[PDB]
């Protein structure tokens, strides 16, 4: 539960870091954002779940 | 202080506030790169 | 050839770093008060 919490929360940080640098260069170079519209979508969707994971999971650690 | 668990992120939150300023800065990195059009 | 805009933003942060070290030194050095 605890480590499980620290995993989700810490991963949620690296995903954001990657997501934050991602989305820009994505819409930036029109070399796709059609194949990346897939990547970005998975990043966006995943993120939300993660926040909700850390959300509910917070009340069990702290 | 930050709730016991998040304590490991204390150092992280210590820098978060300054971030907004960076954006105002970044806008200049960009313009420089695009040779001030 | 090294792109100018990179020479600047690197030499730039480099200054914010040294000048920032000075500002830290104001709460630790001899210029402290403690």
């Amino acid at each position: 539960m605890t480590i499980l919490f620290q995993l989700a929360l810490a991963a949620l940080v690296i995903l954001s870091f990657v997501m934050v640098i991602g989305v820009p260069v994505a819409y930036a170079s029109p070399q796709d954002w059609d194949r990346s519209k897939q990547l970005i979508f998975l990043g966006s969707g995943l993120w939300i779940a993660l926040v909700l994971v850390v959300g509910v999971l917070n009340f069990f650690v702290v | 202080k930050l709730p016991e668990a998040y304590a490991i992120f204390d150092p992280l939150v210590d820098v978060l506030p300054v971030i907004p300023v960076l954006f105002l800065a970044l806008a200049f990195v960009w313009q420089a790169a695009v040779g001030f059009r | 050839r090294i792109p100018l805009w990179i020479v600047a933003t690197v030499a730039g942060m480099g200054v914010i770093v040294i000048v920032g070290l000075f500002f830290y030194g104001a709460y630790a050095g001899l210029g402290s008060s403690l």
Binding site: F17, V20, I21, P24, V25, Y27, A28, S29, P30, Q31 | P11, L12, D14, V15, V18, I19, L22, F23, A25, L26, V29, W30, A33, V34 | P3, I6, T9, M13
Partner: peptide, 28 residues
């Protein structure tokens, strides 16, 4: 102790997201 590790990365992050664009040349 030394969360300067943090700043550093999120600091080089800004210029990076435009640098990668100077490589992939487009939309600046």
């Amino acid at each position: 102790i030394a969360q300067l590790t943090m700043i550093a990365m999120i600091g080089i992050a800004g210029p990076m997201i435009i640098f990668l664009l100077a490589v992939r040349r487009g939309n600046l």
